Subunit: 136 residues, 3 copies
């Protein structure tokens, strides 16, 4: 499974909309500090998924231009991402929010801050992981 | 090869057209009963590929709203899908029909019933299989 | 990793544009002679990537209708493709050229000959390889 280049940046033609799903799989590097998945719109980051091993947390936020909003860190269970372990992320878009699952199990919801879904037409993946697959 | 969520539903931007191909791979579960692949248009199922292990057959049909048409079950050879065995499905769209191959070998043709190809813009996969990859 | 059909032909909706990337992975057959990757526009081959084991070279060219232009064969290092060995090709599109990397390492640049990027909307892969994945 040859890896994707990192960072990986690709446009999501048509943008987002209810029932739209973005899937990603790969492996967290052995000594990973952090890695992220961004759903961007022009110059803004509509959704920022930032798992942090240095902080043992999963940070989610939105950046408008140069401004980060208020972070959301709550998790229903233990940090699902593990160093050196393969993973899969399923981002499902709904009308009111994004639903994120990790390794087949729902993890959290993120209410839209940028609601013009069609304008969220760019995916960026970077950080300490080996990206092996993307389904947009 | 992390699996896709099931059922898997994704839009085929631009719909179908001659030379358009949809590829899928995965593994039939050990005790699979049935699984299907649908090419949908709005509220209709333009093409329904339904391999059945309980009946040992490969059923193809079209549903307009709530009405299933006349089923097509003929096969040139033995049922290619096997429980617990990996497979690949290649659906090639032509002007007059869809040509389906399984594991690299042509299996059957399905003449279009819904001929407005561009309107066939949705793919649904469900049933007793582990879906590992899709190329639309 | 079930293989893709060969030759593999798929449309690149929206065509090319700066920052657009096409990724491919697969395995060169044991006794491969040659294989190619084409970025086409209507009836022209905007970009032709033709690794040749019989000549031990990597040929790049453009075909307008029935006319092949002047070939580019220069390589900064040894032929990266090896018979029976897996590989990955990353084609990055920029405003002035295409940047090609093989197995994660930049290999060469190809200045655009057909500059109407959006019109380069078709990918063709053929020849002596087992194509296991494409990301357009
Ligand atoms: C607890 C807390 O508020 N800490 C924050 C850091 O999380 C924050 O780091 C940035 O966070 C954003 C997402 O909110 C991006 O991930 C960015 O890459 C991080 O640098 C810093 C900086 O804003 O502020 C506090 O330390
Ligand atoms: C031999 C025969 O005609 N049997 C049919 C069943 O195949 C049919 O089951 C449905 O078939 C459609 C496709 O034609 C869908 O797969 C659907 O999910 C099945 O339930 C039933 C019901 O229409 O009628 C006969 O039994
Ligand atoms: C050294 C040299 O000029 N040799 C060329 C061949 O490379 C060329 O072969 C064709 O090359 C084009 C790309 O330039 C395509 O790959 C095509 O499939 C090849 O047949 C031949 C024919 O034009 O001319 C010289 O021999
Ligand atoms: Ni893929």
């Amino acid at each position: 499974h040859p890896a994707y280049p990192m960072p990986f940046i690709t446009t999501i033609l048509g943008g987002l909309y209810p029932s739209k799903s973005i899937l990603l799989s790969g492996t967290v590097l052995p000594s990973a500090q952090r890695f992220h998945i961004n759903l961007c719109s022009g110059n803004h980051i509509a959704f920022h998924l930032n798992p942090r091993f240095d902080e043992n947390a999963v940070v989610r936020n939105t950046q408008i231009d140069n401004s980060w909003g208020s972070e959301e860190r709550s998790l229903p269970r233990k940090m699902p991402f593990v160093r050196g372990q393969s993973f899969s992320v399923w981002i499902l878009c709904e009308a009111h929010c994004l639903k994120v699952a990790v390794d087949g199990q729902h993890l959290f919801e993120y209410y839209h801050r940028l609601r013009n879904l069609p304008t969220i037409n760019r995916l960026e993946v970077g950080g300490d992981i080996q990206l092996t697959h993307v389904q947009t």
